[model samples]
Target: PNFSGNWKIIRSENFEELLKVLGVNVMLRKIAVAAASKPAVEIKQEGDTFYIKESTTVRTTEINFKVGEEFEEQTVDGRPCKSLVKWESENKMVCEQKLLKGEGPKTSWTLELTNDGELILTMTADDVVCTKVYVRE
Candidate 1:
């Protein structure tokens, strides 16, 4: 998995609106819009072990996983979730996470990986998917 390049979001579909609904403040949205435009993603994998970091000017996320393992994955702003992971193959990985705190609604993250080495992280809540994609950096 050579996940080490810059990924640009060419299309966001319904995900952008979902972020607005999540109350991601306007300033953050503006920042997100103006930030790196094509943020980078870097992954260092050793056998079944993997370490990934996705970052932007507005937020950043770090993920570490081994196939079929479960671990705690946190959001850029400290939202908490527990992730159960598996891989379709070395070049493809999938993750599902469930929220664990607070008085707000429930949210979860589902990530899909492509052979082309792009990662699509879909953070969904109440049928809304707030998505972000990362290419190799």
Candidate 2:
């Protein structure tokens, strides 16, 4: 799966709760919730390298990572993690993220293309789960 496209967020669930578990402040959570409406993202894959650009009204983040390689990552809300991305199946990518400091959620993020051509992102931490669906634009 190429996964190289500009996608627009169509729906999200438990996103704020995920952020809260990651230590996002209340004010930031409010801003995130408001900006999360119509959020935009771009995912580009080249060989084993992947570049993901996420955009919202309040922030735009560009992240670059390689498959099977461990790298430091910072969550959008600013939590630090040592992360690695690996293929879970033919067309699915799984990201293992371990939080750097204190006590918090160590999350696994899954990205896969739906049969209907939509992008599905699933994030899980403890009992918190967030799912976002995206469509190419």
Candidate 3:
């Protein structure tokens, strides 16, 4: 489960539903679905440091951090936010995020790696309702 490579979004089982947890509007959901069609997420890791890039037809953003390190991070969508990544268990990742003023809704993504080359992605706000999955590349 060395997720330290390029990964792409092949399909989002519950992506739209997850975005809803982000409080995205109908227009955003529609646009995001189209964007997700061509979205790619890349993660480069050396030791405990991680450099991640998320790209799509609409926008692209990069994030840099280390495991268990808290950094002030906000998306390119002008959402003031901060996030911290922690290891829950094994290759399980827990990403906690809090949003600010007129930006993306306060949301977080929890991702886990199975023995197989696959990722189970969960986007949650207040509950464990919305979830998605991405295959490893």
lDDT per prediction?
0.64, 0.86, 0.72
List, residue by residue over 1-137, the lDDT tens digit for candidate 3. Answer: 46776676654666677666556799988888788778778888786688988788887888899888887777423376778899898788888886755544456777787787776777665553455566756
Q: Give per-residue CA lDDT, model 1, range 14-132, as digits (tens).
A: 55466577677887766766663656566676767778776667667788888678788864335687777776665656666666675454655555667766677666666676667
- The deviation in Å at residue 1 for candidate 3 is 3.9
Per-candidate clash tally = 4, 0, 0
Q: Between prediction 2 and prediction 3, which has the larger lDDT?
A: 2
Question: At residue 86, what lDDT does model 1 achieve?
Answer: 71
lDDT of 2 by residue, 1-137 (tens): 78899999888999998888877889999999999986889999997799999988888878899999998877546778888999998788999888788766667888998778899999888778899999999
- lDDT score, candidate 1: 0.64
Span of ten consecutive residues with least summed lDDT in model 1: 2-11
